[PDB]
Amino acid sequence: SFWEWLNAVFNKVDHDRIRDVGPDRAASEWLLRCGAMVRYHGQQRWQKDYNHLPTGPLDKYKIQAIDATDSCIMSIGFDHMEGLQYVEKIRLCKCHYIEDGCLERLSQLENLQKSMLEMEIISCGNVTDKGIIALHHFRNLKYLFLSDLPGVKEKEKIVQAFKTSLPSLELKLDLK
Numbered sequence: 001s002f003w004e005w006l007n008a009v010f011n012k013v014d015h016d017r018i019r020d021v022g023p024d025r026a027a028s029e030w031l032l033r034c035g036a037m038v039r040y041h042g043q044q045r046w047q048k049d050y051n052h053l054p055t056g057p058l059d060k061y062k063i064q065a066i067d068a069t070d071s072c073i074m075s076i077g078f079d080h081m082e083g084l085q086y087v088e089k090i091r092l093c094k095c096h097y098i099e100d101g102c103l104e105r106l107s108q109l110e111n112l113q114k115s116m117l118e119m120e121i122i123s124c125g126n127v128t129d130k131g132i133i134a135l136h137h138f139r140n141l142k143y144l145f146l147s148d149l150p151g152v153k154e155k156e157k158i159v160q161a162f163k164t165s166l167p168s169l170e171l172k173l174d175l176k
């Protein structure tokens, strides 16, 4: 379908673009065009409107935080994350296209494993226990907030999983 193609092309990585402007800028473009926001290291204010992204020095701005709320990001769009070195915070909220496979894909990016400190996943209806468990690879994670994830059926086992795998993790659960 047309809408399927559209979502796919919103997400697809253009490697030429990564070459031309660097990973952080290319990923900023992906996020904003898909209804997400980013905040750079060194900045208080967030980037929220695509057309207002900095023109700036080549590859100077580095993503520190991502807030994807009511966003169409999914699956291979996360390949934009591969070259990002400094991402510390990610919120996924009302991301209706995200699945366990998205979280798996994220969890396997070594660059994110090294940097990630805080994650929030809220009202993403497809996400299950499998996808949450994958996040244990984010070995430096200090805070994880899960809310309104109807696919997460075994919260107690998640609590115990993280207790051993990430003993210093602050886990906040707003789950039925």
Ligand SMILES: [Mg+2]
Binding pocket: 035, 036, 037, 068, 069, 070, 071
């Ligand atoms: Mg948004």
